[PDB]
Design a protein around this ligand. Structure first.
Ligand SMILES: *[C@@H]1O[C@H](CO)[C@@H](O)[C@H](O)[C@H]1NC(C)=O
Ligand SMILES: CC(=O)N1CCc2c(Cl)cccc21
Length: 357
């Protein structure tokens, strides 16, 4: 099945990196008042040289020129209850990542800009155009995303809520689901020079990116960290407490992209074992006061749009179940329906349900 249909943005000034129109894939579920808007991930680029390389060999992440007319909804975007016990009947939206800016940018391609970085405006424009296609009647809009799209949720969920309020739709409950986008600005295991994208330490690329992208962060977080320090707001544990919308955080304790930016590459000796154990403990610590969270002790990357996302469990509860319990909690804890699920065991795959690879 190829069930989500491409719609390029009617406002063609809201563009991918190369000036081609951004867009969204939609599958409507008439009668459902639930809308799931999913932000794709795929790293970022923070200067002309690394963006030029990404344009040569990762062009779908920078341009809509070659996008297919349809996509299959998978995982949380699947309409089959077997694959998606959580929200199989919802209206499904997949928003391709083609701005390379962690969904933060608001800069057009101009005389002085080779590329447009418009991720924040792409989300706003998708929401606006969807309102005429049924979103006006929604009761819940869940803004979800994986990896850079998960960080995109944290950066944009409150702006979507504010946008709908200002447009006159106060009854739409905006919520966030951030998958694999909760990173730590920690020390690398072995230091690298910030010359490329994947090996550059987390707190550095984002600083350059904000300037290059004209990147924007949530207002309360911006007011805490102030000018020149907005990069702090890309880190879940710092931006999350400033957010008003309900946000459910999904995060592997040993996320492969976290390990990559930390220059960890997997017989593990003492120093690396200690480093990995400390990373899991730090991640666990940052989630202690996040009431809706699912954080399994696995070495892996993303979860929610994978077809077998149903398989992982923490403390006997799957992610689709935890998300359903979260829905119920937003109607004091619920009997047999937990929403805070963080593994405590200290090593990758100490949870037997971890993805096998
Ligand atoms: C198109 O989107 C851009 C970017 O947000 C905005 O400046 C402009 O007002 C929009 N125009 C229309 C007609 O929606
Ligand atoms: C893979 C990816 O997308 N990464 C890794 C590090 C990071 C940060 Cl620190 C913010 C937003 C995205 C990403």
């Amino acid at each position: 099945n190829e069930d989500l249909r491409l719609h390029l943005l009617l406002n063609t000034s809201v563009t991918c990196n190369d000036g081609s129109p951004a867009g969204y894939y939609l599958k409507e579920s008439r009668g459902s008042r639930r809308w799931l808007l999913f932000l794709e991930g795929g790293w970022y680029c923070f200067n002309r040289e690394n963006c030029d390389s990404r344009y040569d060999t990762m062009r779908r992440l920078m341009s809509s020129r070659d996008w297919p007319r349809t996509r299959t909804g998978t995982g949380i975007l699947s309409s089959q209850p077997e694959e998606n016990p959580y929200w199989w009947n919802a209206n499904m939206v997949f928003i391709p990542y083609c701005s390379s800016d962690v969904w933060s940018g608001a800069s057009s391609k101009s005389e002085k800009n080779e590329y447009a970085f418009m991720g924040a405006l792409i989300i706003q424009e998708v929401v606006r155009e969807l309102l005429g296609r049924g979103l006006s009647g929604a009761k819940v809009l869940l803004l979800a995303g994986s990896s850079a799209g998960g960080t995109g949720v944290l950066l944009n969920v409150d702006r979507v809520a504010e946008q709908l309020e200002k447009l006159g739709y106060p009854a739409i409950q905006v919520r966030g689901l951030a998958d694999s986008g909760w990173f730590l600005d920690n020390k690398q295991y072995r230091h690298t020079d910030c010359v490329d994208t994947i090996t550059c330490a987390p707190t550095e690329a984002i600083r350059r990116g904000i300037r290059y992208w004209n990147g924007v962060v949530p207002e309360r977080c911006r007011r805490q960290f102030q000018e020149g320090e907005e990069w702090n707001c890309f880190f879940g544990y710092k931006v999350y407490p400033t957010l008003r919308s309900p946000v459910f955080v999904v995060q592997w304790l040993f996320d492969e992209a976290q390990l990559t930016v930390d220059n960890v590459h997997l017989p593990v000796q003492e120093g690396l074992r200690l480093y990995i154990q400390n990373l899991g403990r730090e991640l666990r610590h940052t989630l202690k006061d996040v009431p809706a969270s699912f954080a399994p002790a696995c070495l892996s990357h993303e979860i929610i749009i994978r077809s077998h996302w149903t398989d992982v469990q923490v403390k006997g509860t799957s992610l689709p179940r935890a998300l359903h319990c979260w829905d119920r909690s937003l109607h004091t804890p619920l009997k047999g329906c937990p929403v805070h699920l963080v593994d405590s065991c200290p090593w990758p795959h100490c949870n037997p349900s971890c993805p096998t690879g």
